[PDB]
Design a protein around this ligand. Structure first.
Ligand SMILES: Oc1ncc(F)cn1
Ligand SMILES: Oc1ncc(F)cn1
Ligand SMILES: Oc1ncc(F)cn1
Lengths: 281, 281, 281
């Protein structure tokens, strides 16, 4: 299934027929950070398996829903269950849900994820507003846009220099200042490690030398498909460890330590993003 | 279709039957830079679609011709319409036209492309004689030679240390000195970004740290297949922007700015390469 | 053929029925360095082609055997003929033999390979105990674990920080000290170049900047599959050139120079690894 104009139009025809919502705003929430999606009012929940041309996700399993409703009086659509390229999904499978968002009317996409810290001043539980990226898969001929260009959505050769909207980063920081947690909020460069192994101690050392502030296994593919078709993006990483410090001290990372950090910050992130949605121009 | 001895011999049998030219020299021209190929004398134009075992290019579209004729009294063969790996072509598809060149008798291959500048002293419209490369796809298990080795063409483990012939670089510089444009001519290290997104601002910063002079999305695959089977190579990048400066000043690159630079330099490059062909040993 | 619990159990059922050995220790020997495998006592030699679900290797050709027997009174299993990812084998093909080792009872895996030297103090014929790695394919979405996780073998997101067991590195160094060749033994960080082209002069310069001590085209995939399923690992590189020096002096590497270094050190490595096996806790 190619992520082309006709296959995405077929999916959007089904969603509109079921939901009766035309959303302006899309959200993709990171693992353990999706509590906001249960707070959506006047909801329709749509399993991916019921939507024409949506990718099959029965191998990886776990939740896979599109949720449409209202937050702060705004009309939104959420992916509940994010598709990760380390699972083996092709370029076409990742791109189609984003391109369906576009046809549904999404103009702004808000994204959260979990990441490892590389910059020395970053601590467990800090947040990082992403302002640029280093796309190791893209340099290495695994860019999410490798393949024929779908000209109806965007250009063959996109410019990523404003892929992370500066006015959205400012709005996010203003909201944290209003609530006296700006001291947790940083800006930084995100490195895309295809994964699924955690960054090794010597990979982490390397990324420091190359000026990365955080590293993770998601987000860059969705950002590129969104930028290709003219959707503005805000992306926020929650730091779950300092990998540079682990490397210098011979300490281990693991999934259980990571998920506990998400639990610790989930409710603050929920409230932050609720107010961001309410206050988007 | 594997790029093996028999499939390439089948294609070469067809070309020789149609053209009545045995070329010594191959040329692959970059986008907007192929005007020289219309100046070829006593031509035969052969669409790729008519050549047995040549890769299908009807998805990407646009021109796809092999052109055989005479320049400066020398017998040449040109690819009019270059195959790019960001389109989704496999290793076998890229390699076969080069290996057919070899069976047709090509001993020297001359290549031009468009690239972004990373070295601070490089400006829009400068030329760069490539003297080595950093092959991010190759480090990342997308080398154009991944797969079984075709032993008839070359070794399992090639040495790339003289892939860019030093005497051809000297000849090119001598010709520019004769015409008083040597001040436009540099030498440099080319980084292969698989693409198709332009290098991001923070990717550009990274490449500076790693000692790259230019970056682009082509040329390294063809160079490796040519070196594998013993064809000498000259490769010249036309600089269409300084990406380090764009990053420091928060400026955008785009395809329309890039194509205008090609237009500005096309005729000088045409004349340069005409005299290079005439004067190859 | 997926490298899942049932397909690997089917292979292990066949091996046990033929060999009557339950090994504790696995070995994977590098090119020209497998002489120890002929010294295995009370052997069974099993061609890969006869084992259910083992990957087909008739395209690459050359030896492909599993050998089970006794060394120093210990029960072992060896791969005679290593699978390399530059040949075009998928993730599943590489992983299955290691996962069969696990089901057969392997608790420790010992690995040797040939590599290029990047650290300036390393010379032709030196050995390097690997203590960490930089996995360019993994950063670039070609990690050997990309695809669905096989939960029976290990976790979705493994930690690689103790993938190279520290007590095994110490035991190896102690043995070299006992035999007065500790002056040949170093420790270092290994860069995985997917290959099959040798590291270029400017790739080598880059790797120095990023803190790599050696570079090669194997070993990291097997280490990751082993670590995933809880097998301890010792990995030793034999240095066959200094690629930083070749780059500064404009000198060439080649396969014939490399194989002669293996010949020069094969017998010392054979005896070293024999005593390591004998003395594993
Ligand atoms: O803490 C952490 N989370 C996700 C990562 F990919 C790496 N490190
Ligand atoms: O100016 C420019 N041309 C091609 C590139 F790949 C990047 N930058
Ligand atoms: O000497 C050497 N051996 C293997 C390599 F991959 C590179 N260099």
């Amino acid at each position: 299934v190619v992520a082309n104009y006709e296959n995405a139009s077929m999916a959007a025809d089904y969603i509109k027929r079921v939901s009766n919502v035309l959303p302006d705003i899309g959200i993709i929430c990171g693992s353990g950070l999706g509590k906001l999606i249960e707070e959506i009012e006047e909801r329709k929940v749509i399993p991916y398996i019921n939507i024409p041309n949506f990718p099959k996700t029965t191998v990886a399993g776990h939740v896979g829903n599109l949720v449409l409703g209202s937050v702060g009086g705004r009309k939104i659509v959420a992916m509940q269950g994010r598709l990760h390229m380390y699972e083996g999904y092709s370029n076409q499978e990742i791109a189609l849900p984003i391109r369906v968002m576009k046809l549904l009317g999404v103009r702004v996409l808000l994204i959260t994820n979990l990441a490892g810290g590389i910059n020395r001043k970053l601590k467990s539980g800090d947040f990082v507003l992403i302002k640029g990226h280093i796309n190791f898969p893209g340099l290495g001929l695994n860019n999410v846009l490798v393949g024929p260009n779908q000209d109806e959505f965007g250009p063959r050769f996109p410019d990523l220099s404003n892929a992370y909207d500066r006015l959205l980063q400012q709005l996010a920081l203003k909201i944290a200042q209003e609530n006296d947690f700006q001291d947790l909020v940083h800006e930084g460069v995100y490195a895309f490690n295809g994964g699924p192994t955690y960054e090794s101690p010597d990979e982490s050392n390397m990324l420091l030398k190359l000026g990365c502030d955080v590293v993770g296994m998601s987000t860059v593919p969705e950002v590129i498909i969104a930028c290709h078709c003219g959707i503005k993006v805000l992306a926020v990483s929650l730091i779950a460890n300092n990998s540079i410090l682990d490397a210098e001290n011979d300490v281990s990372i693991n999934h259980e330590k990571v998920l506990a950090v998400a639990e610790k910050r989930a409710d603050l992130l929920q409230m932050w993003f609720k107010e961001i949605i309410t206050r988007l121009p």
